[PDB]
Subunit: 116 residues, 4 copies
């Protein structure tokens, strides 16, 4: 499982579940092509977006539908969505955990890059 | 100033100096159009991007070139850049401060929205 | 496992391993009595600090030896240590995950409070 | 000002107003002694805690009463308070800005250290 997403809610101290997430790969054109997609589980986690054969070196975009999540809660958010953009290079392709902690007016994100 | 940007560095505990920033407005054809550009000062601040008149209701994108900053320091960061996407001035005109705290594998961002003086 | 600690390194995008952690419980006197203690694993995690019988309602302190961690890396840190202080109340006692992301000059912390 | 505190609220995207702050200095008997006290202003800032003269080398503790702030809003937060512990002025005198970004179950803190003007 080369790419995983974890989202937490900072307002309630709990995972952020049923959060929509879209992954994009940079194309020739420099446009963005749809790649992988899901909704976070009960544990705020998303896995099995891709495989080690399909996940090659290149530029990816991870888009988190944060605004949908706050609306659902009756809270007016600042952000349209949270985007994370990185090169999936490093050594060669590896094990990426993209995590995001959310607040109505803020967000933090970190990457944990480990090889077993 | 209706739009102000503040960038800090978490590795050194100082302002992030000469950091490039690009602002875009979502166009009618649903395209991102260049709106304004600049670099952080000595205090990690960016002022004078726009005017109250110019800053109408819409969807804005603030892209911060975090990648070029870390490279200049000898670090190879994870992110290509930090982008902040929001709707502005949709319930009357406000003042926006977008702040970012940067690390090589992480970043945090918050906004302060204020109601102009009348 | 009523209380778990997870620590990540924001400079390197990896767990923060071999990080010393001390837990304290508020005493009668209002002093702090030693309670639980460990070192984070390879995954930056610490578990089995206590049991559901010993973990009763009260005030706890979680002290993370961050300065030791940066020194070891040849990096001069700001902080003497990172402290987290909370009431282990909520409903009755529950499932607490205390997480911390570290930078030489900053730190963020969040609590995830879930009941299975 | 050698020591300045800035607190922001992440739920509302505004400064954290009337937040109490207590500063301590580790004593010789290895006890925490009260050093200074105050409340954040309208801009979420706290100034005038101490003087260059008074602010000697030592170990300081900045305790922020985050618990009382959230209660005042109708929220029951996780933390009892936010504490920042650091060594100050140990390689000559500097200026310190401690900033905190607050949420009910989380907080983030960073420092900006500057070399005085001479
Ligand atoms: N546990 C995962 C990833 C993950 C996700 C969220 C986290 O908490 C925080 C705590 C504070 C923050 O600002 C942020 I962003 C995240 C942490 I620490 C780690 C793994 O290691 O595989
Ligand atoms: N001076 C600026 C804003 C500004 C900048 C950095 C800050 O610290 C932190 C501390 C933690 C964070 O995650 C972040 I993002 C910022 C804070 I609080 C506020 C203004 O008045 O608008």
């Amino acid at each position: 499982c080369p790419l995983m997403v974890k989202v937490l809610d900072a307002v309630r101290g709990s995972p952020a579940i049923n959060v929509a997430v879209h992954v994009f790969r940079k194309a020739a054109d420099d446009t963005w092509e749809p790649f992988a997609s899901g909704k976070t589980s009960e544990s705020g986690e998303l896995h099995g977006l891709t495989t080690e054969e399909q996940f090659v070196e290149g530029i990816y975009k991870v888009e988190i539908d944060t605004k949908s999540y706050w609306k659902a809660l009756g809270i007016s958010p600042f952000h349209e969505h949270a985007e994370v953009v990185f090169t999936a290079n490093d050594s060669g392709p590896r094990r990426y955990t993209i995590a995001a902690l959310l607040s109505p007016y803020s967000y933090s994100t970190t990457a944990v890059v480990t090889n077993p």
